[PDB]
Design a binder for this molecule. Structure first.
Ligand SMILES: *Cc1c(COP(=O)(O)O)cnc(C)c1O
Lengths: 807, 157, 157
């Protein structure tokens, strides 16, 4: 190949001219950078051409606004979307280096946190693959959230210094910087409303390429860094300036800060992305090749609000249009509603974001005025349609009364958007009928569903090339951009060759992940054991404790009859606890405490191993998901909207043990519920238990295997040196357990036995797996994005065709 | 001071010393130092606590009268004050803040502030150190005063 | 930058790095610590300088080309940066100020600020300590390296 020679020549060129190093002084990190630059150069040609193409053809632009972008690592994705993986592997080998070693030096982008952020990243990959003129907008968080470390079995938060050595992917655009205004006061003058005496924070943009899979599109993620404007002063004025500089820069410091007016910092962050972004969208709109003029704005601009975090987009668009662009209020409002769309990710109305009005009086006095005007006009309309309905007016109002007046940002999003969607079929029904019941009665057509999805490139082609090839051999390459083509795998459940091939891939993946496990955690991993994986946020509603009780029950069962034939398990539990969440940190400690007992018991041996997977991130998900046999998706029914981890396990050859909630429902409906290990209380059963009243004591008293497990946890069997360590866990499970852990224990145990009986038969296990994989095509973010594009954005995929670039 | 506004509790500041307290007598002459931070050094002449920040404990005495007897006892309450005074811009701000953090030791009861827990610990030590130095000073300043063997017979804490 | 406004000199800030310097290469990997303040302790294992504040010296290298020869030498210029990271309200403000006072070591040439004289001394030490640690590191990291006896033959300052 001439390709292998080009990468080799480009790597050395970057090493000498970009890094200003030679092979004697270079570190592995320098080698990662040299390669990352080599690979980025292949994107640049397409990136320039793509932006030249959108300027020429002026397509409708999609703006995806999120406070989270859980991007992971970029080197591998970039290499695969450009087809250069094989050429780089060989070039790096010939250079005396190891591609996978270099891949491990890259930092996980500290730009996301959980589901909401990964959803944004999958979306961006799909929008680029579908040829949409899409731009991701967010904050360039300098220190991510935190890297989880486990010290003495407890979680410790370490700072995520991911930009320490620089990010090779991003380009700084200091020339496209915009001012963000805070505080000040508002004056009504004859020339229009003026927002005066404001503090100014500068928004500095950094652009990152978002490549399309096997097309020529390379889109942009534009992330803003907070910087103070520089400069008279007395001693006090000098200290005021240094502090304002620091408070400016900590807007883009960490994701979801705590600090207790660190809530004011969250509001500042929200406005900082909104104002930065909207000024950029408008500037792009009026700077079009060949440009009263704002009437075409809803035809050239869609703004998607990923949760209520970017909710200020509504009154800020109203502000720029009316106070700067001199557009008439009514016209600006009809423009606002048509440009904005809102996606909700939560169930029950109390999770929805609220801000005190007093906080708005101080930080954003002009936006408060606009919000008040939007609300009044909205309630006049409601009063016209439903005369004398006084309680309807209070329910539908964006401003709520209580111990202080508050602004319901969700209500503001509903009123200022043309479309409102939930993230799964039943969640979207709850969004309609319960969360925004009154809004649904007034405008049913506004409310929609956009079932979540995952990208088939990262969550298959990247993390599981072995499985990807085995599917490619049988049904060709077209499924990678049209994942519903995996249904052609259905007849292959009879094929003895395919079954032994899918099983071989899984075991290869299991062996590669065992090697990571033994090296890092120092536990002897059984290769023939079943990989039982539960990876998500440590939270009571997610019920890692339910999984803990199962593990203790199994430990006790091996101890009672050590001669008995037992299905071997490697139980992996991972996830980050919120720093101030006392119960979740107790739970992490329980898992490691259980593991200490289980993994060091000589009677137990190679039958049961328990590991807490430290620092669950995007990059680690890509190692563990392809190696999983069983996926635990065991949240209490009625708590989960969707879930995307569910989808990742289904595509990578794992069977699912779960409740009938969130994504599991649509996964059952796609593959048939018999191919999934559904158990426990149904949404309606949970409600019926609340009518009876949950008495967890009755369960503990009349379930012997559970009583033994809880007593061990309580008495200090898993914590000999500090026997009251889990007192608050036990106290919660018996008296305050809102998530009904005991109520689902029996059903969960019985269900795990059915899992054990299926794993005992390798062929029928893998047959059920093939049925899962073949019916997962629906859960492609391509499908989700095509849905958003046609039913919300009014754009057609592949209507823009970027041609091969010029160097 | 609790206020009820629109049926809810509002916390208003208790400015009870605004106009002065007629009952109490300031004893600035019986002030004692309270030490914080620093480091500890084991020397041949005994253990030494060095490089400490110092907060001053200023005593105010209030009479506690006995019912139909002639006894009037003392309540001795300590106010936190920073010692006064070279400096660069940063050293000046450090001093102003330490002055404020000193004085907020005796600002409010059970403060919240989340290292306002550190402020509770400071408050606890401030009363302990102030008081114990005063108890000892009183003990050795007795009319006609190895010598500490009688301490448990002359002092109950 | 001198500006003449109404016939008088006005001092305008020289924002020369605003858009970046294309000539220089950042070497964050060759950063060295600079120590300030602290105290000194004579121990049996030698003199120790303890409880110091640390400012980081980040090197930036600029090429210095020879005329019609193949030599391109180095100008190595140090930027002051504070080390990053528990804290109460006062400790937080102390940290933000020390961060600012660290970074203003490499802000302007010949600053005025009147303990801006202390800032000049800090600047002087910052270049000295940064540089001498770099000179020594280069000396002992030579291809094939009591050992300091050749130092005056391999080093002129
Ligand atoms: C896909 C993914 C998630 C989402 O998991 P859910 O529990 O399904 O919300 C979270 N974290 C990481 C690292 C992921 O890759």
């Amino acid at each position: 190949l001439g390709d292998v020679a080009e990468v080799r020549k480009s790597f050395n060129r970057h090493l000498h001219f970009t890094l200003v190093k030679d092979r004697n002084v270079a570190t592995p990190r320098d080698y990662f950078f040299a390669l990352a630059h080599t690979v980025r150069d292949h994107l640049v040609g397409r990136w320039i051409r793509t932006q030249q193409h959108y300027y020429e053809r002026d397509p409708k632009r999609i703006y995806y606004l999120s406070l989270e972008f859980y991007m992971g690592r970029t080197l591998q994705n970039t290499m695969v979307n450009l087809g250069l993986q094989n050429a780089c592997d060989e070039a790096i080998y010939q250079l005396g280096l190891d591609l996978e070693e270099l891949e491990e030096i890259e930092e996980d982008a500290g730009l996301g946190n959980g589901g909401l952020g990964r959803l944004a990243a999958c979306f961006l990959d799909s929008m680029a693959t579908l040829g949409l003129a899409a731009y991701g907008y967010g904050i360039r968080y300098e220190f991510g959230i935190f890297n989880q470390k486990i010290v003495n079995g407890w979680q410790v938060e370490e700072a995520d210094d991911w930009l320490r050595y620089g990010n090779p992917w991003e380009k700084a655009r200091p020339e496209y910087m915009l001012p963000v205004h805070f505080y000040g006061r508002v004056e009504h003058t004859p020339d229009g409303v003026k927002w005066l005496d404001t503090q100014v924070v500068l928004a500095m943009p950094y652009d990152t390429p978002v490549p399309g899979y096997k097309n020529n599109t390379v889109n942009t993620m534009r992330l803003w860094s907070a910087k103070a404007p520089n400069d008279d002063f007395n001693v006090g004025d000098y200290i005021e300036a240094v502090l304002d500089r620091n408070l400016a820069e900590n807007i883009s410091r960490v994701l979801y800060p705590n600090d207790f007016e660190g809530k004011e910092l969250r509001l500042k962050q929200e406005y900082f992305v909104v104002a930065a972004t909207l000024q950029d969208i408008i500037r792009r709109f009026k700077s079009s090749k060949f440009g009263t003029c704002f009437e075409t704005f809803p035809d050239k601009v869609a703004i998607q609000l990923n949760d209520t975090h970017p909710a200020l987009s509504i009154p800020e668009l109203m502000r720029i249009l009316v106070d700067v662009e001199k557009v008439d209020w009514d016209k600006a409002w009809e423009i606002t509603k048509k440009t904005c769309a809102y996606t909700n990710h939560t169930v029950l109305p109390e999770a929805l974001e609220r801000w005190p009005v007093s906080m708005f009086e101080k930080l954003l006095p002009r936006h408060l005025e606009i919000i008040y005007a939007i609300n009044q006009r909205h309630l006049d309309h409601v009063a016209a349609l439903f005369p004398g309905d006084v309680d309807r007016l209070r329910r539908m109002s964006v401003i709520e009364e209580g111990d202080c007046k508050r602004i319901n940002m969700a209500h503001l999003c509903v009123i200022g958007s043309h479309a409102v969607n939930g993230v799964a079929r039943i969640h979207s029904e709850i969004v309609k009928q319960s969360v925004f019941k009154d809004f649904y009665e007034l405008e049913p057509e506004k409310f929609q569903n956009k079932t979540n999805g995952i990208t088939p490139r990262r969550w298959l082609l990247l993390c599981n090339p072995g499985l990807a090839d085995t599917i490619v051999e049988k049904i060709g390459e077209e499924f990678l951009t049209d994942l519903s083509q995996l249904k052609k795998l259905l007849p292959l459940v009879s094929d003895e060759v395919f079954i032994r091939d899918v099983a071989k891939v899984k075991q290869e993946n299991k062996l590669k992940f065992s090697a990571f496990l033994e090296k890092e955690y120092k536990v002897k991993i059984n290769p023939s054991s079943m990989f039982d994986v539960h990876v998500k946020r440590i939270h009571e509603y997610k019920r890692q404790l339910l999984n803990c009780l199962h593990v203790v029950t199994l430990y006790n069962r091996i101890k009672r009859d050590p001669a008995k034939a037992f299905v071997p398990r490697t139980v992996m539990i991972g996830g980050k606890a919120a720093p101030g969440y006392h119960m979740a940190k107790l739970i992490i400690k329980l898992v490691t405490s259980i593991g200490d007992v289980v993994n060091h018991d000589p009677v137990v041996g190679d039958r049961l191993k328990v590991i807490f997977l430290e620092n669950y991130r995007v990059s680690l998900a890509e190692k563990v998901i392809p190696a999983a046999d069983l996926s635990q998706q065991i949240s209490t029914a009625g708590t989960e909207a969707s879930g995307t981890g569910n989808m990742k396990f289904m595509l990578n050859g794992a069977l699912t043990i779960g409740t009938m909630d969130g994504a599991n429902v649509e996964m059952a409906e796609e593959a048939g519920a018999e191919n999934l290990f559904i158990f426990g209380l149904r949404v309606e059963d949970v409600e019926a238990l609340d009518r009876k009243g949950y008495n967890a004591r009755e369960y503990y008293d009349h379930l012997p295997e559970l009583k033994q497990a809880v007593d061990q946890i309580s008495s200090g069997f898993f914590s000999p040196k500090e026997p009251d360590c889990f007192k608050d866990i036990v106290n919660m499970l018996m008296h305050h357990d809102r998530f009904k852990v005991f109520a689902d224990y029996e059903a969960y145990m019985q269900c795990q036995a059915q899992v054990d009986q299926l794993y005992r038969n390798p062929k029928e296990w893998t047959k059920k797996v093939i049925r899962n994989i073949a019916c997962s095509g629906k859960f492609s973010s391509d499908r989700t994005i095509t849905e958003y594009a046609r039913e919300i954005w009014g754009v057609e995929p592949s209507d823009l065709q970027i041609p091969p670039p010029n160097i």
